[PDB]
Design a protein around this ligand. Structure first.
Ligand SMILES: CCCCCCCC/C=C\CCCCCCCC(=O)OC[C@H](COP(=O)(O)OCC[N+](C)(C)C)OC(=O)CCCCCCC/C=C\CCCCCCCC
Ligand SMILES: CCCCCCCC/C=C\CCCCCCCC(=O)OC[C@H](COP(=O)(O)OCC[N+](C)(C)C)OC(=O)CCCCCCC/C=C\CCCCCCCC
Ligand SMILES: CCCCCCCC/C=C\CCCCCCCC(=O)OC[C@H](COP(=O)(O)OCC[N+](C)(C)C)OC(=O)CCCCCCC/C=C\CCCCCCCC
Ligand SMILES: CCCCCCCC/C=C\CCCCCCCC(=O)OC[C@H](COP(=O)(O)OCC[N+](C)(C)C)OC(=O)CCCCCCC/C=C\CCCCCCCC
Lengths: 281, 16, 225, 101, 99, 83
């Protein structure tokens, strides 16, 4: 347990956007208290996460410390300005945060952080419709922002306009063909959206996600259940009926195999057997 | 420098 | 051979290498210091990102069903939709870019000239391969010899060989694609060429045969632990 | 392992020693002026062995290759991470109220 | 399948680093041995294929996911290696055999 | 299915790129691509030849000219064919 090890752990926990605020805030506090001078400016990015975790963790005592250090180091910085905006939003102080973001925008119009923070404020206030409208307007100038695209898709899913969410996930897959998570989420959204005309797309995209990653057993039994629903639908044609029955049988075989592997990996009561007891039904 | 001129003429040639 | 003065090594051989190495480092650091991003307004970045989205769609729309793709096509290149139709609009910048382009080679040649004056009249090192006699006037600047072997080189060309052979070292230590070496503007035409290209593009839903190519082999499952 | 790095160091040292030997041998000729015109077998064997070991170490020092298939490092990315969207964080959750304000 | 630009760039960078280091070392060794003329140049080629063999050992089995083909292992940046090889060759042959 | 819950229903400007209506709208060049460099290479070659003593007084310019249009084409012959 050396400061390099926790530094690498924090770097990994930053590269993939985790939100285990307690662990990251504890590690960051240890780093900035014990090994603050053991390494150079690489802690400064840490000083971002550490405060955000604090706002997530509720421990506001060190949020002021980190903010004051960053401000005294970086006067008139748009990143630190957004960070102050988040500090203000931590206590639902929305008017001052909005004014600060407007000042940032009038100082620099190409900044994208201020728009995202202001729409985060709007969605925190519960005005979902105006938040969706603001995101739609913001994308009209910044088509291609994958993060905002996925956030808009998630908001549409929450508000249950599954057509727009499916469209946004389609264009997200356009952006990133090789991410199986997007394919799985789009298959789920399409399955939830409607019937056979969308069930076919859902099962095709579930198969695509399985091809892109064999371990996504979530999408595995998602494909299984989509095929089963297609089978149970009277409108399915005879050739479609036998095709989806074959797909369901293959998926069931894969599910029994996967749960047998789950069995050999652990050592306990055979709940996985109970699990395939469900498949036999 | 004659050498500098004779080696910077290609530099103008290299740019063009 | 030739009994060259030992003091030529400690003051004409090593200092040339050190000068070349650290001048390359200086040039790279000055290049990164000088580079400043030009201010971009909303419209230019917006259209650049829009054409980025269009090109990535053209590249990998195969993973998107047919109706979504042809709706993309309607949105992009079709009178009725309106997009791609109602979307269009000594100078300092030229001098600055010309100076920046010039400063990548000219400092090396000026250093070479200064070295040629400063270290004129020596024989620094013997190039270990038999260069041609016709190359004599540039390898042996500042030497009045006539029958000297062409493999003996003066200071200027030795420095030139050093600056040619040190770029790989720069990439080794400085970082990949370093700037120490020796070696869209218009959106309307871009809009029109994207129009024509995406008109020429077709659709091939890559999911039409994914299941059959998936059914053939069992799913990899080892390493679940 | 890290010892590879140490290995390459000694390799360079070996090469450096070879240089010294070669220099001395050259002085030999510069004081013998005989028709030898040949390096000692010891120095050339030492130089070649140092080259071999140093190159073998360097190959390890270069690093580790990375796979081209984009679904390699993304295999372990669970859906609980990709959904966070760090720019669009919201602080109106139960975390603040539950935890110490 | 789906190539990732970052990984292929990293592979190219590590291959280039290994090639540059081996070419510089080969130049130093050829300068040490006092090789002169064509016999020197051939040595470089030999050194190169030696590195290739080592790279074949480094990639080893299952290299198909590392490179599209073995070709960049052999002829990857050969001229860039040759320039540094001749520089270090002249350097060492100058500060060893000339004086 | 005893747990077939439906989550669709009410659908509420429009998101950019969205369009609700389902619309039903739906040798040779290699010779020119090879002759391009086959005709551009002599131009640089002719310029280098007509340079004369300027080319002689510019040893580096000749190498760059011979590596720009020629040499690179031979080195990137596979790339040229694949393009
Ligand atoms: C006292 C002795 C002087 C200390 C050494 C001088 C420090 C020079 C370092 C340097 O900064 O110089 C490196 C440049 C790099 O080239 P650059 O044009 O890309 O960066 C320059 C950008 N700019 C053109 C706008 C200036 O090259 C050059 O000018 C090198 C100029 C060569 C003149 C040698 C000086 C002779 C000693 C007196
Ligand atoms: C007898 C003739 C032989 C000539 C010697 C040249 C070959 C010897 C080479 C390497 C052996 C050192 C091994 C130590 C491990 C270093 C690499 C590493 O894995 O460790 C990582 C760290 C930091 O990585 P990085 O970003 O800095 O590397 C650049 C990253 N990349 C390669 C993708 C661009 O490495 C660090 O500690 C920072 C230091 C990086 C390596 C410094 C060595 C370069 C210094 C001088 C080279 C020649 C200058 C003088 C010669 C003049 C004669 C003409
Ligand atoms: C690879 C490095 C080459 C190995 C050194 C070979 C060598 O040339 O060895 C001989 C020198 C001994 O020269 P000296 O001081 O006895 O005569 C000087 C006479 N005076 C004092 C009047 C100027 O020793 C040396 O390392 C040469 C010192 C300069 C070369 C080393 C720099 C590269 C690191
Ligand atoms: C001592 C001299 C030996 C040099 C022989 C050599 O150059 O190496 C050749 C083999 C590489 O080709 P491969 O025989 O493995 O089959 C092809 C590999 N595939 C199926 C992934 C395409 O490397 C190997 O010896 C395999 C090294 C495995 C070490 C256990």
């Amino acid at each position: 347990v050396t400061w390099e090890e926790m530094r690498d752990k924090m770097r990994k926990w930053r590269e993939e956007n985790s939100r285990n605020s307690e662990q990251i805030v504890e590690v960051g506090e240890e780093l900035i208290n014990e090994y603050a001078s053991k390494l150079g400016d690489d802690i400064w990015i840490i000083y971002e996460q550490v405060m955000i975790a604090a706002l997530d963790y509720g421990r506001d005592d060190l949020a002021l410390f980190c903010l004051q250090e960053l401000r005294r180091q970086f006067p008139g910085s748009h990143r630190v300005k957004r960070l102050t905006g988040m500090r203000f939003e931590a206590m639902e102080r929305y008017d001052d945060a909005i004014q600060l973001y407007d000042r940032i925008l009038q100082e620099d119009p190409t900044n994208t952080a201020a728009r995202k923070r202001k729409i985060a404020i709007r969605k925190a206030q519960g005005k979902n419709v105006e938040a969706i409208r603001e995101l739609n307007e913001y994308l009209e100038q910044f088509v291609g922002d994958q993060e905002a695209w996925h956030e808009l898709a998630e908001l549409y899913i929450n508000e249950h306009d599954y057509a727009k969410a499916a469209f946004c996930l389609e264009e997200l897959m356009m952006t990133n063909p090789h991410n199986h998570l997007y394919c799985q989420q789009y298959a789920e959204v399409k399955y939830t959206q409607g019937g056979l005309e969308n069930l076919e797309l859902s099962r095709k995209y579930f198969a695509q996600a399985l091809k892109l990653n064999n371990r996504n057993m979530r999408a595995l039994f998602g494909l299984y259940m989509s095929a089963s629903h297609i089978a149970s639908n009277p409108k399915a044609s005879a050739k479609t009926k036998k095709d989806n029955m074959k797909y369901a049988s293959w998926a069931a075989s894969q599910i029994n195999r996967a749960y047998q592997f789950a069995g050999r990996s652990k050592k306990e009561t055979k709940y996985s057997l109970k699990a395939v007891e469900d498949m036999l039904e | 420098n004659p050498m500098v001129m004779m080696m910077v003429l290609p530099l103008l040639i290299f740019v063009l | 051979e030739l009994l060259l003065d030992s003091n030529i090594r400690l003051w004409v051989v090593l200092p040339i290498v050190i000068i070349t190495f650290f001048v390359g480092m200086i040039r790279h650091y000055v290049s990164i210091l000088l580079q400043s991003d030009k201010k971009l307004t909303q419209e230019q970045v917006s259209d650049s990102q829009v054409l980025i989205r269009s090109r990535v769609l053209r590249e990998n729309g195969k993973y998107i069903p047919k109706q979504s793709f042809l709706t993309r096509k309607y949105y992009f290149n079709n009178p009725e939709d309106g997009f791609f139709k109602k979307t269009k609009r000594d100078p300092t910048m030229l001098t600055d870019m010309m100076k920046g382009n010039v400063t990548n080679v000219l400092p090396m040649i000026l250093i070479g000239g200064w070295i040629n004056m400063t270290f004129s009249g020596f024989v620094t090192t013997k190039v270990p391969f038999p260069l041609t006699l016709r190359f004599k006037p540039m390898l042996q600047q500042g030497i009045e010899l006539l029958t000297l072997d062409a493999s003996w080189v003066s200071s200027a060309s030795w420095y030139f060989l050093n600056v040619f052979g040190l770029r790989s070292i720069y990439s080794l230590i400085l970082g990949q694609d370093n700037a120490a070496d020796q070696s869209p503007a218009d959106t309307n035409k871009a809009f029109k060429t994207e129009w024509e290209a995406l008109e020429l593009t077709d659709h091939q839903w890559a999911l039409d045969d994914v299941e059959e190519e998936l059914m053939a082999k069992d799913l990899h499952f080892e390493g679940m632990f | 392992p890290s010892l590879w790095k140490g290995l390459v160091g000694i390799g360079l040292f070996a090469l450096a020693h070879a240089a010294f030997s070669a220099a001395q041998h050259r002085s030999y000729m510069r004081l013998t002026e005989k028709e030898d015109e040949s390096l000692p077998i010891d120095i050339v064997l030492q130089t070649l062995l140092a080259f071999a070991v140093t190159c073998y170490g360097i190959v390890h020092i270069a690093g580790e290759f990375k796979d081209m298939d984009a679904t390699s490092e993304l295999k372990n990315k669970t859906f609980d991470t990709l959904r966070n969207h760090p720019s669009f964080y919201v602080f109106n959750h139960r975390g603040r109220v539950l935890f110490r304000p | 399948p789906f190539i990732s630009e970052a990984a292929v760039r990293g592979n190219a960078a590590v291959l280039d680093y290994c090639r540059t280091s081996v070419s510089a070392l080969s130049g130093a060794t050829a300068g040490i041995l006092g090789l002169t003329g064509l016999y020197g140049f051939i040595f470089y080629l030999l050194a190169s294929v030696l590195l290739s063999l080592l790279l074949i050992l480094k990639a080893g089995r299952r290299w198909n996911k590392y490179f599209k083909s073995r070709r960049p292992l052999f002829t990857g940046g050969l001229i860039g290696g040759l320039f540094t090889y001749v520089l270090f060759w002249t350097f060492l042959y100058g500060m060893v055999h000339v004086y | 299915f005893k747990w077939a819950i439906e989550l669709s229903g009410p659908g509420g400007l429009y998101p950019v790129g969205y369009l609700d209506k389902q619309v039903p709208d739906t040798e040779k060049r290699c010779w020119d691509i090879a002759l391009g460099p086959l005709k551009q290479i002599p131009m640089n070659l002719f310029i280098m030849y007509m340079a004369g003593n300027t080319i002689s007084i510019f040893p580096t310019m000749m190498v760059c000219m011979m590596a720009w249009r020629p040499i690179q084409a031979l080195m990137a012959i596979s790339a040229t064919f694949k393009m």
